[PDB]
Amino acid sequence: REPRNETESRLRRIFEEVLHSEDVDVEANFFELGGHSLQATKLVSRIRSEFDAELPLRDFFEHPNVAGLAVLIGG
Amino acid sequence: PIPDDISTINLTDPRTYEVNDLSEYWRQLRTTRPLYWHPPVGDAPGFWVVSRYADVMALYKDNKKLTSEKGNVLVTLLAGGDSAAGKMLAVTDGAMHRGLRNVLLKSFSPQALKPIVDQIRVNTTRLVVDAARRGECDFAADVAEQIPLNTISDLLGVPAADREFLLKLNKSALSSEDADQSATDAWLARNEILLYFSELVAERRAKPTEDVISVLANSMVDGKPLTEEVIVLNCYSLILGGDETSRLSMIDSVQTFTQYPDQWELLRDGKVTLESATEEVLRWATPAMHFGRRAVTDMELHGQVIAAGDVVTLWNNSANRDEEVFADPYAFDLNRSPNKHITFGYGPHFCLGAYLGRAEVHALLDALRTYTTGFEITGEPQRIHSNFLTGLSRLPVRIQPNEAAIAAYDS
Ligand code: HEM
Numbered sequence: 410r411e412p413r414n415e416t417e418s419r420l421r422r423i424f425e426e427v428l429h430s431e432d433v434d435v436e437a438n439f440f441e442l443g444g445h446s447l448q449a450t451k452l453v454s455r456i457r458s459e460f461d462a463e464l465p466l467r468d469f470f471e472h473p474n475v476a477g478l479a480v481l482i483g484g
Numbered sequence: 485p486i487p488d489d490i491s492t493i494n495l496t497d498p499r500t501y502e503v504n505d506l507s508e509y510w511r512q513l514r515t516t517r518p519l520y521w522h523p524p525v526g527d528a529p530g531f532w533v534v535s536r537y538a539d540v541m542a543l544y545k546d547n548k549k550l551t552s553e554k555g556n557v558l559v560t561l562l563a564g565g566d567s568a569a570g571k572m573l574a575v576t577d578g579a580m581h582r583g584l585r586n587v588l589l590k591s592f593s594p595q596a597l598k599p600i601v602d603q604i605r606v607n608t609t610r611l612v613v614d615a616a617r618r619g620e621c622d623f624a625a626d627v628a629e630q631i632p633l634n635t636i637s638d639l640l641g642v643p644a645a646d647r648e649f650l651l652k653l654n655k656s657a658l659s660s661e662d663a664d665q666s667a668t669d670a671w672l673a674r675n676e677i678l679l680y681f682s683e684l685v686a687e688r689r690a691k692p693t694e695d696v697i698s699v700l701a702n703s704m705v706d707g708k709p710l711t712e713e714v715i716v717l718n719c720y721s722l723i724l725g726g727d728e729t730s731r732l733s734m735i736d737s738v739q740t741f742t743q744y745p746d747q748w749e750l751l752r753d754g755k756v757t758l759e760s761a762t763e764e765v766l767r768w769a770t771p772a773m774h775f776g777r778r779a780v781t782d783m784e785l786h787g788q789v790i791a792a793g794d795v796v797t798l799w800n801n802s803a804n805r806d807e808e809v810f811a812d813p814y815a816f817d818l819n820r821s822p823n824k825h826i827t828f829g830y831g832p833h834f835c836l837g838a839y840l841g842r843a844e845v846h847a848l849l850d851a852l853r854t855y856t857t858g859f860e861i862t863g864e865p866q867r868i869h870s871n872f873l874t875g876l877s878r879l880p881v882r883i884q885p886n887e888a889a890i891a892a893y894d895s
């Protein structure tokens with residue numbers, strides 16, 4: 410499935426950069442893509458800076474997908 | 485309560501260590517089943533349990549047939565691996581381990597730590613004396629928690645403001661004050677440490693101070709600098725390592741003294757050296773109960789075969805109670821000699837902070853010896869919950885002061 414936002418698109422690029430991968434599904438679970446701790450750290454710290462929004466790690470754990478994270482950065 | 489049958493004991497469950505006295509369990513394992521196969525529980529696989537002191541050090545030193553690179557504690561070992569493999573010292577083998585250790589040994593050797601050892605004595609005494617004046621207090625919160633973490637943080641270069649917050653994270657990382665804790669809270673707590681150190685190591689790579697983080701940021705293994713990832717991961721193992729186990733050791737020394745007043749008196753009246761006492765405190769309170777490895781090849785031990793890829797768990801607390809090594813193992817004896825316990829492990833991965841661990845215990849014993857006549861438990865203590873660590877969250881005590889010695893300290 411294709412990204413539908415500047416946000417979804419940019420977030421998916423961050424996922425791809427961190428998971429050392431390409432063509433990362435927008436609704437795929439971060440862990441199910443083989444996502445471990447230090448990856449998740451680099452991921453969360455980058456989203457925090459690039460979008461200038463305080464993202465609590467807990468909320469990331471609940472919604473660890475490009476699709477869901479977009480909504481949260483928005484709302 | 486002292487359980488009798490092997491089969492109904494789950495070592496992965498923290499509840500087991502709270503509501504059982506496992507002395508008979510380990511004795512039976514030591515004598516009749518030295519290599520024992522713990523069954524699988526839920527999704528977790530089964531694993532070998534090693535309980536004899538001889539076996540425990542034999543395998544601690546075999547980093548050729550066994551590896552730390554797939555986890556060294558149950559929570560990672562049972563998960564199938566450790567993210568920090570080949571990057572964090574504890575879960576790295578081979579030449580990367582040898583190099584990364586020699587880099588760290590330059591700032592954790594007895595030579596390098598002598599300035600810090602003086603500061604521990606000073607800070608320790610102050611906390612002890614101020615707790616004596618108060619009389620009634622919580623020793624864990626008012627004394628113990630205040631030294632190990634602050635010492636390692638002084639070394640690493642963690643700003644003072646953040647230490648209280650890091651302390652809160654350590655209490656959830658591998659142990660828990662809450663009996664019912666989910667793996668999620670543990671996961672988040674661990675990861676919030678990495679998040680903190682991502683930012684701090686970033687600041688020090690750009691603007692280097694004199695601290696231990698800066699030493700790592702200026703160091704090389706095999707002619708190439710260390711990744712910000714590698715440094716962050718070892719800062720985790722240092723902030724967590726430099727804290728919990730020493731903290732729990734100190735608290736346990738006090739609780740054990742109230743039970744064994746004959747031994748407390750030997751220390752107070754200088755009938756035993758601080759060197760000798762420290763070692764018994766360590767053997768007695770074996771804070772890290774277990775550590776582990778995975779087999780890389782097949783092994784033959786006690787006529788049984790450990791297949792490549794099996795988890796092997798080594799039990800320090802059982803090894804430190806082995807009758808064949810320690811005469812009257814369950815006697816708290818400050819004069820115990822020899823005292824070649826295995827609280828700090830053995831072999832290539834021998835505890836990096838061993839000298840610092842002793843130092844912190846040594847100091848506490850020296851302070852308690854000088855400025856205290858005795859102490860008493862004033863309300864029931866709370867245990868931590870873990871299948872890896874053992875110790876106390878809080879310890880309510882009344883400390884009977886040495887007014888004579890305390891007054892001379894005011895100079
Ligand atoms: C009395 C308190 C302590 C206890 C009971 C303890 C226990 C242990 C044990 C058993 C190991 C070996 C683990 C293995 O073989 O996989 C170890 C390793 C280690 N410890 Fe400690 N330790 C203590 C104090 C400290 C302190 C104060 C520090 C802070 C510097 C520290 C940092 C480390 C590190 C970095 C390793 C990994 C070394 C390697 O892999 O080569 N420890 N500790």
Ligand SMILES: *P(=O)(O)OCC(C)(C)[C@@H](O)C(=O)NCCC(=O)NCCSC(=O)c1c[nH]cn1
Nearest residue numbers: 445446557560566567568574674721724725729
């Ligand atoms: P994520 O993929 O869940 O992983 C987080 C992390 C990178 C931290 C990972 O390595 C992990 O889960 N480790 C397990 C926790 C751990 O082993 N901590 C260090 C143990 S304390 C210790 O070794 C020691 C020695 N002396 C005193 N304490």
